[PDB]
Amino acid sequence: DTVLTQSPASLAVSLGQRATISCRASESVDYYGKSFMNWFQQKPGQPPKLLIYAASNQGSGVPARFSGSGSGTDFSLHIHPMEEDDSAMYFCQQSKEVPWTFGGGTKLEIKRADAAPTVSIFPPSSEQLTSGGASVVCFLNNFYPKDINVKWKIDGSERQNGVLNSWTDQDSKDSTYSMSSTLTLTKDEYERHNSYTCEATHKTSTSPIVKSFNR
Amino acid sequence: DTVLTQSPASLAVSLGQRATISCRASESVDYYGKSFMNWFQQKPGQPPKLLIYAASNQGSGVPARFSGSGSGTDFSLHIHPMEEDDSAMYFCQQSKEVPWTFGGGTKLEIKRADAAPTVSIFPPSSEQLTSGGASVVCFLNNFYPKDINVKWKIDGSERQNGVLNSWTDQDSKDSTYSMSSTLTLTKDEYERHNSYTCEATHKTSTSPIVKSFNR
Amino acid sequence: DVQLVESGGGLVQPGGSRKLSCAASGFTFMRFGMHWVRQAPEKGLEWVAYISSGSSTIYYADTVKGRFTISRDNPKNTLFLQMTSLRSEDTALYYCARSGGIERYDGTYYVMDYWGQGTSVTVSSAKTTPPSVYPLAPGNSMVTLGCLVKGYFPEPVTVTWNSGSLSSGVHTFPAVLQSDLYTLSSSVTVPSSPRPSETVTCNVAHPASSTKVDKKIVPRD
Amino acid sequence: DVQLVESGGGLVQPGGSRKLSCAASGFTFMRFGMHWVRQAPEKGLEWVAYISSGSSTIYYADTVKGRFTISRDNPKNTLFLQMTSLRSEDTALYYCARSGGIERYDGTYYVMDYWGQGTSVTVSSAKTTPPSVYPLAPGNSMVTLGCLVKGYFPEPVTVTWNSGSLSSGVHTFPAVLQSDLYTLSSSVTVPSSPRPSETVTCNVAHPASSTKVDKKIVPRD
């Protein structure tokens, strides 16, 4: 099997700049003088779309801002300039041998201005409490870069146990990211503590955004 | 008041081509050397976005593919190359005097290949018939250009009376248009006739697409 | 990030009154002048009013002079538009736009750089009416189904297929006004295999009449 | 216009079977070889099977060899994938891609030029469970509200706000699996004026349990 290895795994390019994704094969991919390397584009909740075929040929309706190159083992995808709609997963694929193999994908994103997150905290609902559970929800909305450190403090103590964080893919109109952190306990344990704190350290500041509530 | 007149009213440029929208003022718009012409872009169900300010300066995050020129009375917006996301209403506006005046707008669209429409016909529903009405609906889907001639035949007769046609804006991923044509009669009248035809003449053919049903 | 959010719109009777708000965020509100621009098919974009950061200066478009009153609450980051003596001609979508200053070489230049989604204001005496949803059942590998929602007022109506699951291949057409009542239609294309084996239902909502209806498309027979 | 629409997906027990279809449109189906490609977080894109226009030739990826069977109904413009002896490893989104040939003067080059939306196939023994929707009420010119929908299986769940009226400023987060039960949360931001003076409600639909619930966010107290 021809293994295709792309690099980097994730990018972040400012609007107007050039993005270049590398894809190398374990075995040659051009039979004769034609390179069987294809590139696809896949936006979230979307089927892949053919971008380049035979190494450097534009797919249908593909802007001249996307170009492909390389031969044999090493291939590259170029995007210049970067535009607000290009954020997507790009995969390379060889179609010389069977099976047809794809690369791991490279997630290219728009590097926008930094953006601090908007943290909101919500205590368990009466309805959930009534059912014996106590989920505390914390929304860290619209920040950039996605690199963030989300932690919980129960009465001042670090609680690693019981939380599920979830990020949203780069926003389409914003280029920001979002996240929900949820701490789940039992009604009983929830009632054993007073203070519940949701904290976020992000490069936009040295002090974390601490959001809290006393039950 | 400074009246701004845009031209053309509508366009249709192919991907990769250059679009040029003209905007002329009744009175000069540059105060000395500074031109006070601004351009906005408005995609359907969207607020207007600043594209160009002061005749030729690019707004924030606006690709180098958009440019503005002109002076005094005449100005122009340029788009090259054309891309699948550009379909929007473009407006010019002067900010030299009060009131602040905008042009009428120029609807730019992607000239894609011709596509014949997909016609579907539907008779009155039992529920609607049970209420005494009889709406006959016809969907002319996914075509291009939007220029289409839709007509109804009742037992072979031209029926101009009672129909409401409604087009969808150029589709975002397709670049096609669609349309519903609804003939409304009373349950009584509808039951006086046998054959109901929905017809469409479109440049993709010389004969119309006839869709009908016999109640 | 600059954020502007309008609210307050609705259906108002001719001669009536309505006050629109505009909630700003992501910028030092008290430092910027604000605007109110509106749109209507019979209008396009049309400037309505201007107010400086300190309100010392305000401008009105002639058609609005004497009836509307722009104002702001710098502490609440809110801009307002108090409309009175409404006429059909005022029916439109209202946007509040920020008068951002671009620091130019020849001095700062002001341009309405940020806009909100807007709020719809309809001025009519016509009476609020809930719509009637009728299933558009079929008479190829794909079948087109649909729903007709007629006789409602005012706009808008919300149309979804299978609660939002069926999203691809959906066409919800612009409503048409015929004698103070709107009529609209939506089509959904599915593989012929899925129908009728698998249920297709249009979910229609008309907030103004608090009416929400689900209509399953069943074969005629 | 080339058009491919997959269906048949769903939740299947380990060791079970399911057949996915793929309805084509816009091209002479019987002249194009077809493919089935699948994607999972832990897989990315992975080729599954290939079948020539006349089916005289077929290829299977090793992992699928002996269990799946690709086939086609040229007259009905349908392509199929019969899966049996399913394993969790088969859980993925299945796309059918069209093997189109670019008439190169160097010899026609074949590339999967058109794909479909795909169908979800989850292979698990975890039991179908309707979720619990809980109201996320607040403790600025804008206020963030939300809904927590936890304890459901399988995916997906549909979340809408105010029947879809509220669409701007909504974040519906990816569901997380924690012991065969999913949990997801959605957030809506509205001008502080609107709440609570005007209702905000999250409309949540879970097709698999045929559950649909609307939860109004009311102040805590």
Run of H or E residues at B165: strand B163-168
CA distance A138 to C165: 27
Give φ, ψ of A107 to 5 degrees.
Answer: -95, 100
- Which residues, 6 or more positions from B83, have their beta carbon under 8 angstroms from its beta carbon? A63, B15, B65
Task: Give D160's contacts in chain C (Cβ within 8 Å).
Answer: 160, 163-164
Asked whether the beta carbons of residue D160 and residue C160 sit closer than 8 angstroms, the reply is yes
CA distance D80 to D94: 11
The burial class, CB within 10 Å (0-12 / 13-18 / 19+), for A33 is exposed
CA distance B29 to B35: 6
Quick one: three-class SS letters along D74-138?
Answer: HHHCEEEEEECCCCHHHCEEEEEEEEEEECCCCCCEEEEEEECCCEEEEECCCCCECCEEEEECC
Asked whether the beta carbons of residue A120 and residue D176 sit closer than 8 angstroms, the reply is no
Pairing, β B209-214 against β B195-202? antiparallel
* DSSP type of residue D73: E
**Per DSSP, what are the bridge partners of residue B67?**
B78
Task: Give C191's contacts in chain D (Cβ within 8 Å).
Answer: 5, 7, 21, 23, 78
Task: Give C1's contacts in chain A (Cβ within 8 Å).
Answer: 115, 142, 174, 176
* DSSP type of residue A126: H
**Nearest-neighbour CA in chain D from A62: distance (Å):** 12
**For chain B, give me the number of helices (H) and strands (E)?**
2, 20
Resolution (Å units): 2.6
Task: Give D1's contacts in chain B (Cβ within 8 Å).
Answer: 115, 142, 174, 176
CA distance A211 to A177: 19
CB C27 within 8 A of CB C33: no
Q: What's the Rg (C-alpha) of chain A?
A: 23
- Which residues, 6 or more positions from D67, have their beta carbon under 8 angstroms from its beta carbon? D83, D84, D85, D86
Task: Give C162's contacts in chain D (Cβ within 8 Å).
Answer: 207
CA distance D26 to D5: 12
Q: Is residue B82 classed as helix, strand or coil in its secondary structure?
A: coil
Asked whether the beta carbons of residue D185 and residue A60 sit closer than 8 angstroms, the reply is no
* DSSP type of residue D189: E
Give φ, ψ of D54 to 5 degrees.
Answer: -100, 0
- Which residues, 6 or more positions from A98, have their beta carbon under 8 angstroms from its beta carbon? D50, D59
What chain A residue is nearest to B16 in terms of C-alpha separation?
A63
CA distance A124 to A213: 11
**Nearest-neighbour CA in chain D from C142: distance (Å):** 7
Which sign, positive or negative, has the C-alpha torsion C160, C162, C167, C171?
Answer: negative
CA distance A143 to A113: 10
Backbone torsion region of residue D186, taken as left when φ is above 0, otherwise alpha when ψ lies between -120 and 50, otherwise beta: beta
Asked whether the beta carbons of residue B47 and residue C138 sit closer than 8 angstroms, the reply is no
- Note the Cα B174 to chain centre separation in Å: 14
Run of H or E residues at D20: strand D18-25
Way it was determined = X-ray
Tokens for C54?
């300190």
Closest of B213, B190, B194, B215 to residue B131, by C-alpha: B190
**Per DSSP, what are the bridge partners of residue A198?**
A152, A211
Count Cα atoms within 13 angstroms, Cβ side, for C113.
21
**Per DSSP, what are the bridge partners of residue B57?**
B53
CB A1 within 8 A of CB A101: yes
CA distance A110 to D153: 34
Closest of A167, A107, A120, A113 to residue A144, by C-alpha: A113
CA distance D148 to D173: 10
Residue with tokens 């002067």: B94
Partner-chain residue, chosen from D44, D111, D115, that has the shortest CB–CB distance to A102: D44
Pairs of CB atoms within 8 A across B/D: 4
**Per-domain residue ranges for chain A?**
1-112, 113-212
- Which residues, 6 or more positions from C213, have their beta carbon under 8 angstroms from its beta carbon? C133, C203, C204, C205
CA distance B57 to C113: 13
Asked whether the beta carbons of residue B63 and residue A85 sit closer than 8 angstroms, the reply is no
Chains that touch B (3 or more CB pairs under 8 A): A, C, D
Question: What is the length of chain A?
Answer: 215
| Whether the domain at A1-112 and the domain at A113-212 fall into the same CATH topology | yes
User: Residue B43 is which amino acid?
Assistant: K
CB A93 within 8 A of CB A4: yes
The burial class, CB within 10 Å (0-12 / 13-18 / 19+), for C164 is middle
Partner-chain residue, chosen from D142, D165, D168, that has the shortest CB–CB distance to C158: D165
Q: Is residue A149 classed as helix, strand or coil in its secondary structure?
A: strand
Give Cα separations from D84 to D12, D19, D123 (angstroms): 10, 9, 11
Chains that touch C (3 or more CB pairs under 8 A): A, B, D
Residue B34: count of CB within 10 angstroms of its CB: 14
**Nearest-neighbour CA in chain C from B15: distance (Å):** 23
CA distance B45 to C12: 22
Asked whether the beta carbons of residue D205 and residue C163 sit closer than 8 angstroms, the reply is yes
Give Cα separations from B47 to C114, D3, D195 (angstroms): 9, 32, 24
**D1: contact with B, CB 8 A cutoff:** yes
Tokens for A32?
């004769």
Residue burial A158-178, b: 16+ Cβ < 10 Å; e: rest = ebeebbbebebbbbeebbbbb
Asked whether the beta carbons of residue D171 and residue A131 sit closer than 8 angstroms, the reply is no
What chain C residue is nearest to B43 in terms of C-alpha separation?
C117
CB D49 within 8 A of CB D64: yes
CA distance D201 to D178: 26
What torsion, rounded to 10 degrees, do the Cα atoms B58, B173, D112, D32 define?
-150
What is the assigned CATH class of domain B1-112? mainly beta
Residue with tokens 């309809």: C122
Q: Which fold has domain B113-215?
A: Immunoglobulin-like (2.60.40)
Pairing, β B57-58 against β B106-108? unpaired
**Nearest-neighbour CA in chain D from C87: distance (Å):** 25
Q: Is residue A129 classed as helix, strand or coil in its secondary structure?
A: helix
Give Cα separations from D76 to C157, D23, D29, D57 (angstroms): 37, 8, 9, 20
Tokens for B159?
């029926």
Closest of A85, A177, C45, C91 to residue B47, by C-alpha: C45
* DSSP type of residue A52: E
Tokens for A179?
């996240």
CB C117 within 8 A of CB C20: no
- Note the Cα A41 to chain centre separation in Å: 15
CA distance B13 to B88: 12
Tokens for A36?
């069987």
Domains of chain C: 1-125 (2.60.40.10), 126-219 (2.60.40.10)
Closest of B175, A164, B94 to residue C47, by C-alpha: B94
Quick one: three-class SS letters along chain C?
Answer: CCEEEEECCEEECCCCCEEEEEEEECCCHHHCEEEEEEEECCCEEEEEEEECCCCCCEEECCCCCCCCEEEEECCCCEEEEEECCCCHHHCEEEEEEEEEEECCCCCCEEEEEEECCCEEEEECCCCCECCEEEEECCCCCEEEEEEEEEEEECCCCEEEEHHHCECCCEEECCCEECCCCEEEEEEEEEECCHHHHCCCEEEEEEHHHCEEEEEECCCCC
Q: Is residue B191 classed as helix, strand or coil in its secondary structure?
A: coil
Residue B125: count of CB within 10 angstroms of its CB: 25
CA distance B24 to B37: 10
- CATH for A113-212 is 2.60.40.10
| Contacts of range A174-177, beta carbons closer than 8 Å, 24 or more positions apart | A174/A112, A174/A142, A174/C1, A175/A84, A175/A87, A175/A109, A175/A110, A175/A112, A175/A144, A176/A112, A176/A115, A176/A142, A176/A143, A176/A144, A176/C1, A177/A142, A177/A143, A177/A144, A177/A145, A177/A146
| Contacts of range D55-62, beta carbons closer than 8 Å, 24 or more positions apart | D59/A98, D59/A99, D61/A99, D62/A99
